[PDB]
Amino acid sequence: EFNILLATDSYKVTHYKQYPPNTSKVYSYFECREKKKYEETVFYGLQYILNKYLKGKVVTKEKIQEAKDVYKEHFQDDVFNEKGWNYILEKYDGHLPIEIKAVPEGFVIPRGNVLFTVENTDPECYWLTNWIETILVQSWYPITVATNSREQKKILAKYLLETSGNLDGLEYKLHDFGYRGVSSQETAGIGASAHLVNFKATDTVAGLALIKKYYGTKDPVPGYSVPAAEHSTITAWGKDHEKDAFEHIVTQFSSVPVSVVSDSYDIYNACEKIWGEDLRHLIVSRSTQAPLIIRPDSGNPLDTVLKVLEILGKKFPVTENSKGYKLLPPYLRVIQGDGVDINTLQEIVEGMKQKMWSIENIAFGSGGGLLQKLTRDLLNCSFKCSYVVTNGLGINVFKDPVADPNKRSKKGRLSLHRTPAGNFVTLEEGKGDLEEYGQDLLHTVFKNGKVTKSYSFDEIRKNAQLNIELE
Amino acid sequence: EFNILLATDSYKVTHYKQYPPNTSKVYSYFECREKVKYEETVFYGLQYILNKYLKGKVVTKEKIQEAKDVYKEHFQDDVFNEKGWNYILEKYDGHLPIEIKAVPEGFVIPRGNVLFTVENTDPECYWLTNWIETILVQSWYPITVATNSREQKKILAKYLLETSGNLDGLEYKLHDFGYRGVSSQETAGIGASAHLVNFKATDTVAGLALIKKYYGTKDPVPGYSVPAAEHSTITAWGKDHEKDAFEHIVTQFSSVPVSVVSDSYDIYNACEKIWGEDLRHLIVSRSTQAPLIIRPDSGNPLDTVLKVLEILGKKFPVTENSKGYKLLPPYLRVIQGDGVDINTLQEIVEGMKQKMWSIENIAFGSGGGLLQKLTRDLLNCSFKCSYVVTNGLGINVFKDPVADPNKRSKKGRLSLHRTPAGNFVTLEEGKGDLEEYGQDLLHTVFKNGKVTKSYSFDEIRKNAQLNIEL
């Protein structure tokens, strides 16, 4: 079972001995620090952490003794704050005397703004605020995935609109294939849920269970998939029977959309000769609601996409849409699910536009690129102490390393506000109290062991909408 | 609760309908596919996956109905194989009819070799082999962490040996600070455990519990830490009181080693004036077993390390060791815990060598670089089908994409062997049965819901040692 006393960085165990004596309050904040592009971030994921790990009775006699035993060996010394944890157990029935205030989930906030703050609600628990830094800071991951997914949605929307005149199907143009490429089952659920903030296309099922348990949607599920082959379901038929495999699978799934990986031996032969001649009759008869979706999976992603399109365009009846771009017949589409990250996504749609192919023809699958190839320094997600009270006097505190101005942290009590032009500003030094900038956008979401405000996944999606979607 | 019927890629739900009719066997393997870096990998972490997710009764009526209801909405259609999963429930009491063979954990094997194989033990369950690809393939992460961690140990060993004449303290020279920088609690435990295959220094507490539960050590714990400050324990004292913070912390931890972050405002001032002058008397009185470990945390990592060392070497009594390199007194050390990954680690130690500083002086902390900035394509970890039986006839199967030879997979029944020169070779096409290469080095580790062979964390560590350690 999860033990909050064993869910921190080891050195934090020793910090209760290092703060200034007579310190009654430690107040800390999280930002995605600005760096001298990712100019705005989606706040998403805190609610999951609050519910799974921080709420309710998280301290027990047994958990205290377990931690004491572990730390005695780990440190080869007794340095553990057994008294402090006992106090929380006795006074608060093991609920954390902590208050967390946060921007609403799904909100899209420029870099360098406070997104949440943390403080102890009992003077004895000054040490507790930063104890939970480690667990709260992991919110960087759903924030970063949601943000990066949204940034790719902006690219897709831009090119789709330019090449087609609309945004139909935008929410299915980036399909999560990342389940096998992430570091764990838990990460898979979290990351998949973050992508779903922006899109509805996914193969990472763990996402759906997380959303149902922690957020909830009006619809039965937040995300969807369609039948698709993998290489094993093609190669199992034998090298000489790729066509038999193709035929069997599109016939099995004749009335729904079906993706068929086509590069097992020779992607270009498969498109030109197998799909384009041998089995053409099984493709052109298909419904508009059930296209064949041809899937290349190797080679340079842009070059292979263009070559596949060029091949298919000469074997199938292509039209020119009202924008002047080429469109495959409705029963035939393509998905590129290899080598896709935000960078190659951009290169591919731009290459397509250059060769006069509509973005309507294509969708993208991304796995590692989407859910794994991201770190905490992408958005400089960071948690810092900005305010303490020592001997009954509050002091504004911060770091400001001489060699790196980018690492300077904010000072004092913080609040988030709308600017007169409708943007965001973070007020420092408790200046929000002057009430010159309207209401604080942070809300209490956790206080003394209870989750005090929650958002549905539907609200989060609404908050995270693109401007182009609003317009 | 965890539901293995909901722990696969969506499309695999539809694959039982896509295999050739009358397929009775699907056999698949995992390798770190070959492409000058990462020529060999540490096999680690499958044991965790077998135990936490695959073993025992993993199928119930409840789980089957839950999967049915989710998939009906997820596909907007009924395509889920209720019957196949019920068959497993009713025939095998929900235990998976699967056999898995694997190289021993901790083993170091060149790229391009079979590391584990998977096959169904019941003909009705031909579809099960690749259903669990997704979960098994996540072994890439502990493999990749362990491997990249060990490569860093190699660098440290080489430089420590050259600048000091020995390897004392090697296993404490790379310290896991990645708890906050990974994507989840589960990842934290897995990744930290993997680092611990090579080192004993960690702040990622989650790793200890995983190791204790799934592997085991003779010693009470696999990894250790020491007291250390963070910016909040310095800055809370106020900008004008950095000295008071330093003095309090080192006095509180006077007889154990203590790391103190010294760059909150001005690292060079803190080293030269606060540590080097105002508080010097509190440092030079410390035990060899309880050094002050000064921690810079910003600026160019190499440049800052060198300047910190130059500063300290002028304020403190420096010796020259037997190899001719400079050594801080034993009560004073440095840890660089910012911007450290395998590339910058190499750059720092090489730069220290050029300025004649022993690697004895320093340790490194790595977080994101150690546990998060890694992907499945670093070692090309990959799971593929190589052998099927259909209509009673065994077929050797494979992919071979025209535009990418590096993605070609292996054919047929596989086995792993020692060569006459004592290296590893993977035999394809069932050629291991010809018995020209001696015994298959893979062992059966899972069969029909039971874990059938396992390794302690002490043995895994022994298997993973460096040559120079041997």
Numbering used by the authors:
A (entry chain A): 8 to 43, 53 to 487
B (entry chain B): 8 to 42, 52 to 486
Tell me, in the authors' exact words, what the paper reports.
NAMPT functions as a homo-dimeric enzyme that catalyzes the rate limiting step in the primary salvage pathway for NAD synthesis, the transfer of a phosphoribosyl residue from 5-phosphoribosyl-1-pyrophosphate (PRPP) to nicotinamide (NAM) to produce nicotinamide mononucleotide (NMN). Crystal structures of NAMPT in numerous ligand-bound forms have been reported. These structures consistently display a NAMPT homo-dimer with two essentially identical active sites at the dimer interface. Typical NAMPT inhibitors were found to occupy the portion of active site responsible for NAM binding and a tunnel-shaped cavity extending from the NAM binding site. Furthermore, we determine the crystal structures of six NAMPT mutants in the apo form and in complex with various inhibitors and present a definitive model to explain the differential effects of the mutations on various structural classes of NAMPT inhibitors.
The crystal structures of G217 mutants revealed that they also perturbed inhibitor binding through a His191-mediated mechanism. Glycine is required for this position to allow a water molecule to bind and participate in the D219-H191-WAT-Y188 network. The addition of a Cβ atom in G217A occludes the water molecule and disrupts the hydrogen bond network. In addition, A217 pushes the H191 imidazole ring away from its normal orientation by 30°, rendering this part of the tunnel less compatible with GNE-618 binding. Similar to H191R, inhibitors with narrow and flexible linkers, including APO866, are less sensitive to the relatively subtle changes induced by the G217A and G217V mutations, which is also consistent with the modest drop in the biochemical potency of compounds 9-11. Compounds with a bulky phenyl group in the core (series A and compound 12) were less active on all G217 mutants, while compounds with a narrow more flexible linker (series B and compound 11) maintain much of their potency on the more conservative changes of G217A and G217V.
